Curated annotation (Swiss-Prot), chain A:
It comes from the Eukaryota. Belongs to the AAA ATPase family. Component of the 19S proteasome regulatory particle complex. The 26S proteasome consists of a 20S core particle (CP) and two 19S regulatory subunits (RP). The regulatory particle is made of a lid composed of 9 subunits, a base containing 6 ATPases including PSMC5 and few additional components. Component of a complex with USP49 and RUVBL1. Interacts with PRPF19. Interacts with TRIM5. Interacts with NDC80. Interacts with PAAF1. Interacts, in vitro, with the thyroid hormone receptor (in a thyroid hormone T3-dependent manner) and with retinoid X receptor (RXR). Interacts with ERCC6. This is 26S proteasome regulatory subunit 8. Component of the 26S proteasome, a multiprotein complex involved in the ATP-dependent degradation of ubiquitinated proteins. This complex plays a key role in the maintenance of protein homeostasis by removing misfolded or damaged proteins, which could impair cellular functions, and by removing proteins whose functions are no longer required. Therefore, the proteasome participates in numerous cellular processes, including cell cycle progression, apoptosis, or DNA damage repair. The chain holds residues 154 to 394 of 406 of the full protein. Residues 33-224 are annotated as: May mediate interaction with PRPF9. GO terms for molecular function: ATP binding; ATP hydrolysis activity; DNA-binding transcription factor binding; general transcription initiation factor binding; proteasome-activating activity; TBP-class protein binding; thyrotropin-releasing hormone receptor binding; transcription factor binding. Keywords: Acetylation, ATP-binding, Cytoplasm, Nucleotide-binding, Nucleus, Phosphoprotein, Proteasome. The gene is PSMC5. Its main location: cytoplasm. ATP binds at G37, P38, P39, G40, T41, G42, K43, T44.
Swiss-Prot record, chain B:
GO terms for biological process: blastocyst development; proteasome-mediated ubiquitin-dependent protein catabolic process; proteolysis. This is 26S proteasome regulatory subunit 6B. Component of the 19S proteasome regulatory particle complex. The 26S proteasome consists of a 20S core particle (CP) and two 19S regulatory subunits (RP). The regulatory particle is made of a lid composed of 9 subunits, a base containing 6 ATPases including PSMC4 and few additional components. Interacts with NR1I3. Interacts with PAAF1. Interacts with TRIM5. Interacts with ZFAND1. It comes from Homo sapiens. Component of the 26S proteasome, a multiprotein complex involved in the ATP-dependent degradation of ubiquitinated proteins. This complex plays a key role in the maintenance of protein homeostasis by removing misfolded or damaged proteins, which could impair cellular functions, and by removing proteins whose functions are no longer required. Therefore, the proteasome participates in numerous cellular processes, including cell cycle progression, apoptosis, or DNA damage repair. The keyword Zinc does not apply.
Curated annotation (Swiss-Prot), chain C:
Its main location: cytoplasm. One of its GO terms (molecular function) is RNA polymerase II-specific DNA-binding transcription factor binding. It comes from Homo sapiens (Human). Gene3D superfamilies: Ankyrin repeat-containing domain. Signal peptide: none annotated. It is found in: Cytoplasm; Nucleus. This is 26S proteasome non-ATPase regulatory subunit 10. It comes from the Eukaryota. ANK repeats lie at residues 1-29, 30-62, 63-95, 96-128, 129-161, 162-194, 195-219. The gene is PSMD10. Acts as a chaperone during the assembly of the 26S proteasome, specifically of the PA700/19S regulatory complex (RC). In the initial step of the base subcomplex assembly is part of an intermediate PSMD10:PSMC4:PSMC5:PAAF1 module which probably assembles with a PSMD5:PSMC2:PSMC1:PSMD2 module. Independently of the proteasome, regulates EGF-induced AKT activation through inhibition of the RHOA/ROCK/PTEN pathway, leading to prolonged AKT activation. Plays an important role in RAS-induced tumorigenesis. Acts as an proto-oncoprotein by being involved in negative regulation of tumor suppressors RB1 and p53/TP53. Overexpression is leading to phosphorylation of RB1 and proteasomal degradation of RB1. Regulates CDK4-mediated phosphorylation of RB1 by competing with CDKN2A for binding with CDK4. Facilitates binding of MDM2 to p53/TP53 and the mono- and polyubiquitination of p53/TP53 by MDM2 suggesting a function in targeting the TP53:MDM2 complex to the 26S proteasome. Involved in p53-independent apoptosis. Involved in regulation of NF-kappa-B by retaining it in the cytoplasm.
Length: 224, 237, 219
């Protein structure tokens, strides 16, 4: 995910080294960013990893939708990410329109007036509310970063990060085993590893070979 | 079948018979197993089979075990069970019917249920803190998935969601064989209309229905049970 | 009664001396409308039913529900008892409590000889019960391939609509029987009939088995 972190450095890595001179920087920093696509890798590992490099608090959403907004009002400097909401008018669109009003007043506070510096959040949307939320957000003040499925170059490094945590043989080729993991997104590789450790357990071996990873490839390709 | 017995088998009993392997076999928290399906009886023969395949302690606590006037008895009971579990032996906690104790609430008329669901949040964070070397298993079974709290269904906590099919053909064959194996074997007794009819009219406790059929076949005028007390036992209960 | 123990336990000389001493005991029944023929056929004794049928006991003696002894001999798996009851002229299409026939219960035990003797005497191959289900639904519901095959030796139908609208192919695919589905389809099964749930036999089969079902239909 080198392209995703390279494109997110300006979004999350920007308030890291210079949190105080935002009043001096008059380049109109964007208020939030959205990442649409299969939430394989980038919903928790990216936000908690780059936010773990920021060394700041990480508040999550996880009617009961207003007390967390008051807590977000108290602890304003943080990284808030939508995780539970990412799943004709009617009463259900009025109750949902209460949260639409919550994000409209998040654009009225964030875009209204900067109370405290370092207010940067990340959106998450993958359903019809892409055309509805995008119908209500005509790209006026919003960072548009496209979230593509992880390519092969995004599979070698996510395979390394998701391979260092467990055992690995010294005679495996990451090129072919990375090119032989198709499907939805980067969570499929996590399906190969997490669904391969059970075969390493069943086989009763100290390490994992490339043939076991190929078996997990066949498993995830039969589950897709 | 064998899907549920295999998934609970290798996902449940294989990690149970291994100590401190969690951070060496590809660390994951598949500690929560959730079952579903109102029409299937369940929760009895699976718990018996677990209690026979393994020889350890078992904490059978139906969800309504802490519904009392004392709101503070909850954390004392589940905390004593937690400490005796982590200290004595890796037991298995059977939490049943989470629908009545896993429902959202906004008003304060039912403040007892909100207080015990805040206890459920307390142990919901304790299980997050107990991710390192916890000596207990937490299985779960529910019959309603509409009003469940989103915190339980969040990944990492309940990573096992098994389902029950409406036709329990293999469970009917095993539940009739397990009762006819001890009872007198009649060559007239058929199992095809009694494996095809419960496909339409499905129900629970079929073994208890066979026991009631034996209680109707204890008249001593009929030496072995037959279809009369089978279909009669069906139409009665 | 006492003749229930005599015919149940297989007392030869006690039952012979009991009938020769009191001929009324043969016609006497218990409180469940079950004569000695039902106990000696449920027990599988040959000589006792040869003596009772030798004296000329009515073969169509039905109980309170309607269970004829031919269902007991058919489900009993004893070929000789079927030879005796069919020799005396038993009703091959006797109606029991649930409207079934001895073909369903002879098919339940996977007895080929009983099925050949019953169907040879003039039994209906497409005999439907109260639920409009034939022997192929149950034999396919357990996995009796050769029973369905010997049912196809008499030119039986393979598209009997069940009480829910399920053909024998629906129950064969629901039982996860590949060879049985390929044989029924290869012998004239219909894949276009739908049940009350509006589900085709292709959708009922899991793992992409409908593609090879229709592949064998067109091939």
């Amino acid at each position: 995910l080198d392209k995703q972190i390279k494109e997110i450095k300006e979004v999350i890595e920007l308030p890291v080294k210079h949190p105080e001179l935002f009043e001096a920087l008059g380049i109109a920093q964007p208020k939030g960013v959205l990442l649409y696509g299969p939430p394989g890798t980038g919903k928790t590992l990216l936000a908690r990893a780059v936010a773990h490099h920021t060394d700041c608090t990480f508040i999550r959403v996880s009617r009961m939708v207003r007390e967390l907004f008051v807590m977000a009002r108290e602890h304003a400097p943080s990284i808030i990410f939508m995780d539970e909401i990412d799943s004709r008018l009617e009463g259900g669109s009025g109750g949902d329109s209460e949260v639409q009003r919550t994000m409209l007043e998040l654009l009225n506070q964030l875009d209204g007036f900067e109370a405290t510096k370092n207010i940067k959040v990340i959106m998450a949307t993958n359903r019809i509310d892409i055309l509805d939320s995008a119908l209500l957000r005509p790209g006026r003040i919003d960072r548009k970063i496209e979230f593509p499925p992880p390519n092969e170059e995004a599979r070698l490094d996510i395979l390394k990060i998701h391979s260092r945590k467990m055992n690995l043989t010294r005679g495996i080729n990451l090129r072919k085993i990375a090119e032989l993991m198709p499907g939805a997104s980067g969570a499929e590789v996590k399906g190969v590893c997490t669904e391969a450790g059970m075969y390493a357990l069943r086989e009763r071996r100290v390490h994992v070979t490339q043939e076991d990873f190929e078996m997990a490839v066949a498993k995830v390709m039969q589950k897709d | 079948m064998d899907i549920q017995k295999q998934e609970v088998r290798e996902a449940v009993e294989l990690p149970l018979t291994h100590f401190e392997l969690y951070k060496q076999i590809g660390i994951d928290p598949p500690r929560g197993v959730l079952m579903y399906g109102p029409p299937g009886c369940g929760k009895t023969m699976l718990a018996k089979a677990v209690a026979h395949h393994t020889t350890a302690a078992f904490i059978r606590v139906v969800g309504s075990e802490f519904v009392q006037k004392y709101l503070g008895e909850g954390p004392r009971m589940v905390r004593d069970v937690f400490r005796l579990a982590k200290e004595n032996a890796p037991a298995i906690i059977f939490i049943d019917e989470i629908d009545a104790i896993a429902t959202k609430r906004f008003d304060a008329q039912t403040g007892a249920d909100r207080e015990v669901q805040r206890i459920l949040l307390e142990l919901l964070n304790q299980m997050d803190g107990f991710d390192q070397n916890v000596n207990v298993k937490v299985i779960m079974a529910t019959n309603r998935a509409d009003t469940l709290d989103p915190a339980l269904l969040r990944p990492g906590r309940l990573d096992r969601k098994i389902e029950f099919p409406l036709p329990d053909r293999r469970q009917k064959r095993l539940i009739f064989s397990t009762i006819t194996s001890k009872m007198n074997l009649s060559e007239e007794v058929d199992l095809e209309d009694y494996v095809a009819r419960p496909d339409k009219i499905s129900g629970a406790d079929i073994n208890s229905i066979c026991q009631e059929s034996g209680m109707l076949a204890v008249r001593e005028n009929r030496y072995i049970v037959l279809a009369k007390d089978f279909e009669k036992a069906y139409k009665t209960v | 009664l006492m003749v229930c123990n005599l015919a149940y336990s297989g007392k030869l000389e006690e039952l012979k001396e009991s009938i020769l001493a009191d001929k009324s005991l043969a016609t006497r029944t218990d409180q469940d409308s079950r004569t000695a023929l039902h106990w000696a056929c449920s027990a599988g004794h040959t000589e006792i039913v040869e003596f009772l049928l030798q004296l000329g006991v009515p073969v169509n003696d039905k109980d309170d529900a309607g269970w004829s002894p031919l269902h007991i001999a058919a489900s009993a798996g004893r070929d000789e008892i079927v030879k005796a009851l069919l020799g005396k002229g038993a009703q091959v299409n006797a109606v029991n409590q649930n409207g079934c026939t001895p073909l369903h219960y002879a098919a339940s035990k996977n007895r080929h000889e009983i099925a050949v003797m019953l169907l040879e005497g003039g039994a209906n191959p497409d005999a439907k019960d109260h639920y409009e289900a034939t022997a192929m639904h149950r034999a396919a519901a357990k996995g009796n391939l050769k029973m369905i095959h010997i049912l196809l030796y008499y030119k039986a139908s393979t598209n009997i609509q069940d009480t829910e609208g399920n053909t024998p192919l629906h129950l064969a695919c629901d039982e996860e029987r590949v060879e049985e589905a390929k044989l029924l389809v290869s012998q004239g099964a219909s894949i276009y009939i739908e049940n009350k749930e509006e589900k085709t036999p292709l959708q009922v089969a899991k793992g992409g088995l409908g593609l090879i079902l229709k592949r064998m239909v067109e091939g």
